[PDB]
C-alpha cells in the first residue's frame, strides 16, 4: 500500500490487480513528489454519482433506487456496515 | 418557492406539505438571514448520500446495485 | 431534539435568527410530515461544494481559495510587489 | 488521454510529476484492468474535503472562509503574542 516509483514501475500489473480487489488506494512516493493509485472503476463511479447529486431530491431518488430491491439493500448495508467498523 | 417569513410562518403547514410534496426547497427572506425549509427525507438522505460518499468504492458499490 | 410545526410557526422568526446564528439545522415534526429549517447559506454552500467536487481535484483549489480568504488582501498586494 | 500500463511502466516518475505539476489525474489501462493515478496531496485534500462535507456547517465554512479596526486587530494579536 506504499512503494517507492521504483518499486511500482517494477510491478505496476501486481499494483493494478492489487487496488481492483481490495480497493485500497496505493501511496507510490518520489522525489519529485506522491502519487496515489486507485481502481478506475470506483474512480469513475465516485465522479458519476456526485454528477448527480445537483440537489436534496437527487439523493433522495438515489436512496430509494437503493431501497428498490434486494441487490440494493445488500450494496447498501455492506457499505455502512464498512462505516460502522471504523 | 420563494417567500418572507412572516409570509412564511403563516403558510407554515402548507409548506410543509409542499416541500414533502415537490422536494424542491423553499428559500425564506427576512432581514435575521435567510433560511431554506426543505422536506426531512431530502435532507437524509443528502447527508446520508454525503456520509457514503467517504470511500469512493461505496459509490461504485450504490452505482453497481441499482443496476441490479 | 425535534420540534413540532406548531411550535415552529409560533417561533418561526427566533427559529429563522437561530438557524442562521448557530447555523445548525432544526428538525420539524408534524401530522403534515417533516421538514428541516436551515441557513440558506448552509444550504447553499451544501450544495455548491458538491458540485464543485464534480472534479475531486476542486479540492484542493478550494481548499487554497479559503486559505487565501483567510490569508487577507494583504498577501496579494505583497505578492505583485515582488517583482521583475 | 488515457495511456497503456505498458507506457506508464517506462514513464512512471515522469507520469507523477506531471499529475502533481498540472493536478489532472491520469487513466492507466492494463491487462490486468484500469487505474487512475493522481497526485497524493490532492487525492488527501479530495477524501479530508468530502469527510468534512458531512456537516452543513463545515459547509459552510467551506464557503464562507471570511482598518483602524484590523489595525487594532494586529495591534492586539502582537500584544497578545509578544
Not at 481490495?22 to 481502481?39: E, F, K, N, Y
Not at 439523493?59 to 441487490?71: N, P
Request: aromatic content about 6%; hydrophobic content about 40%.
Amino acid at each position: 500500500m506504499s512503494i517507492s516509483a521504483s518499486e511500482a514501475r517494477q510491478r505496476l500489473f501486481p499494483l493494478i490487480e492489487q487496488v481492483n480487489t481490495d480497493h485500497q488506494p496505493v501511496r507510490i512516493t518520489s522525489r519529485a513528489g506522491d502519487a496515489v493509485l486507485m481502481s478506475a472503476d470506483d474512480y469513475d463511479a465516485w465522479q458519476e454519482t456526485v454528477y448527480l447529486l445537483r440537489s436534496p431530491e437527487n439523493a433522495r431518488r438515489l436512496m430509494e433506487a437503493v431501497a428498490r430491491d434486494k441487490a440494493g439493500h445488500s450494496a447498501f448495508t455492506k457499505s455502512v456496515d464498512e462505516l460502522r467498523e471504523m
